[PDB]
Amino acid sequence: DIQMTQSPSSLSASVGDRVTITCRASQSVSSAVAWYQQKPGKAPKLLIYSASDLYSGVPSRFSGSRSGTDFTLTISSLQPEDFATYYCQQSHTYPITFGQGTKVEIKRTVAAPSVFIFPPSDEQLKSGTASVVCLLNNFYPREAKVQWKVDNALQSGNSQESVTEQDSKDSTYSLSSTLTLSKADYEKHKVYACEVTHQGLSSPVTKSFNRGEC
Amino acid sequence: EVQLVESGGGLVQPGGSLRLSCAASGFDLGGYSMHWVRQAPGKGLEWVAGIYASGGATAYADSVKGRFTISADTSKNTAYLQMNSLRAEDTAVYYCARSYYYGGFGMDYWGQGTLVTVSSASTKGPSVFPLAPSSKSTSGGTAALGCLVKDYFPEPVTVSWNSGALTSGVHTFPAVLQSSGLYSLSSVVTVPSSSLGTQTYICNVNHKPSNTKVDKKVEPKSC
Amino acid sequence: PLQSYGFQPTNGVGYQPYRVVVLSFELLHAPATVCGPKKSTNLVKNKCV
Amino acid sequence: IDGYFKIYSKHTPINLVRDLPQGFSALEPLVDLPIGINITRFQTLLALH
Numbered sequence: 001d002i003q004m005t006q007s008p009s010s011l012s013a014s015v016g017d018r019v020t021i022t023c024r025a026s027q028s029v030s031s032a033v034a035w036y037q038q039k040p041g042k043a044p045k046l047l048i049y050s051a052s053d054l055y056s057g058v059p060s061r062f063s064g065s066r067s068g069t070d071f072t073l074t075i076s077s078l079q080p081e082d083f084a085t086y087y088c089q090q091s092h093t094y095p096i097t098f099g100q101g102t103k104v105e106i107k108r109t110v111a112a113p114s115v116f117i118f119p120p121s122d123e124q125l126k127s128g129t130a131s132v133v134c135l136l137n138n139f140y141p142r143e144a145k146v147q148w149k150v151d152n153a154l155q156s157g158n159s160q161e162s163v164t165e166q167d168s169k170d171s172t173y174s175l176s177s178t179l180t181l182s183k184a185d186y187e188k189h190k191v192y193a194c195e196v197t198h199q200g201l202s203s204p205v206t207k208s209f210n211r212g213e214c
Numbered sequence: 215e216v217q218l219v220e221s222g223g224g225l226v227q228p229g230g231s232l233r234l235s236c237a238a239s240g241f242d243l244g245g246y247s248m249h250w251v252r253q254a255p256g257k258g259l260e261w262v263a264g265i266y267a268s269g270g271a272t273a274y275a276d277s278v279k280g281r282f283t284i285s286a287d288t289s290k291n292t293a294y295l296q297m298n299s300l301r302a303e304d305t306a307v308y309y310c311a312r313s314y315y316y317g318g319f320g321m322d323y324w325g326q327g328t329l330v331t332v333s334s335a336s337t338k339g340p341s342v343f344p345l346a347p348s349s350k351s352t353s354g355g356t357a358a359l360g361c362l363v364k365d366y367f368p369e370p371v372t373v374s375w376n377s378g379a380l381t382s383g384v385h386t387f388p389a390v391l392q393s394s395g396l397y398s399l400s401s402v403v404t405v406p407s408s409s410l411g412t413q414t415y416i417c418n419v420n421h422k423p424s425n426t427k428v429d430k431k432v433e434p435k436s437c
Numbered sequence: 438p439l440q441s442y443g444f445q446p447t448n449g450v451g452y453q454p455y456r457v458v459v460l461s462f463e464l465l466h467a468p469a470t471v472c473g474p475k476k477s478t479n480l481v482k483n484k485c486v
Numbered sequence: 487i488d489g490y491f492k493i494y495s496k497h498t499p500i501n502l503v504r505d506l507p508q509g510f511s512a513l514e515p516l517v518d519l520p521i522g523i524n525i526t527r528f529q530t531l532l533a534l535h
Contacts, residue, residue, distance in 0.1 A: 135360075
């Protein structure tokens with residue numbers, strides 16, 4: 001049972017750029033590390049069978065090498081067809097294991113989000129619960145979070161998240177985050193806020209509302 | 215050309231079981247080990263088990279031992295997975311894949327994956343609620359109306375606006391599976407703010423798998 | 438440790454078999470044999486050479 | 487010398503068996519053998535019935 005670690009969690013490269021993704025087995029697996037290319041809705045494509053064994057049907061762009069234990073996977077000239085999550089597989093010792101998967105971004109313009117805070121509506125509150133919703137629209141880099149506050153305290157564990165896909169020209173995407181309070185808990189707090197931070201934002205954007213507004 | 219084709223997916227009540235199968239096409243399974251792998255929603259790829267088509271020998275991941283059992287039949291040139299005592303945590307797309315002998319080589323032929331789900335609330339329509347727009351415009355002069363879609367099952371759900379006529383300014387998020395055993399997602403439409411009181415904004419939430427749908431109107435409210 | 442190679446006429450160029458011979462040269466400070474012509478030419482008589 | 491065993495030789499009829507034959511003689515070179523071994527000692531070989 002040899003587990004492997006992949007990095008980076010995501011890589012940023014344009015069409016025509018180079019992509020470098022690595023995988024490190026905790027134990028030697030010889031060179032028996034295979035790689036896959038996966039698009040949403042599809043099976044991972046087999047790219048590589050072993051560190052120096054490329055699969056026919058895989059673009060010639062795919063190549064790699066080893067340094068000590070670690071294997072480095074690269075794409076020499078990334079095409080639209082290659083934006084996929086890449087995974088490593090070791091076939092040396094059972095159980096067969098896989099790495100975590102590395103995403104590739106199209107490396108475009110960095111921008112702050114348009115921050116929309118949506119206080120729980122009268123209709124949503126008929127459910128008996130209250131969902132405070134904040135959406136960060138059209139921003140880049142890929143990593144962003146909402147620091148949710150209740151009575152200006154930072155709250156952690158009552159939030160939920162979902163993230164959308166990136167724009168093919170700008171690399172931007174939107175982030176959805178919410179806070180769930182029962183209606184009864186919602187009514188017991190006065191101030192709510194969405195403090196928006198991300199890797200490219202030097203000045204956090206905060207939107208807020210008072211309980212009962214909107 | 216060699217293909218591997220999966221079937222047999224569907225929902226299993228918690229504690230129940232399901233049989234999956236894949237057929238080989240263009241390739242004789244003998245000489246290869248046939249493998250089952252798993253992809254839970256939001257997760258990466260996990261190996262489940264492998265069987266040597268020409269020998270009957272097997273190996274399993276520790277994570278599935280005592281629960282997932284496999285077999286193969288070279289007269290049929292197919293392979294099978296029997297999953298017992300399925301839990302919510304076992305919701306995943308199950309894949310067939312193959313490799314030479316007993317290892318030292320990665321898997322070459324792959325199926326596309328069939329979804330197996332487990333839930334205590336296997337058949338639900340959506341519950342849809344509107345989100346009031348900010349009354350103050352953001353950069354570009356825009357504002358947005360939205361919906362929260364919750365507690366439906368199974369996924370996929372298709373969400374669009376104005377009964378499907380509105381794609382312009384539409385921002386949708388993927389569904390995720392919640393602790394309720396049901397799925398949820400959200401969406402907004404961002405347009406110049408005066409358009410929010412002119413255009414129709416109805417969330418068309420379609421669930422072909424549940425034979426249902428919801429048309430929820432969203433409009434500006436004092437804010 | 439070894440696996441059979443599926444070398445077939447149906448394979449693409451990356452999987453077609455290739456016959457390879459590697460020439461590995463001696464590093465001896467006092468070599469002899471496995472030699473060759475030093476751009477050898479013909480003899481010319483009654484001329485300055 | 488430098489890994490090369492060098493051999494020179496001559497073979498003639500003899501009248502003198504007590505001592506070696508008298509008079510000047512130059513041995514013919516035969517071979518430079520690229521062997522690579524340390525020679526500090528030796529023995530002969532006989533056929534046995």
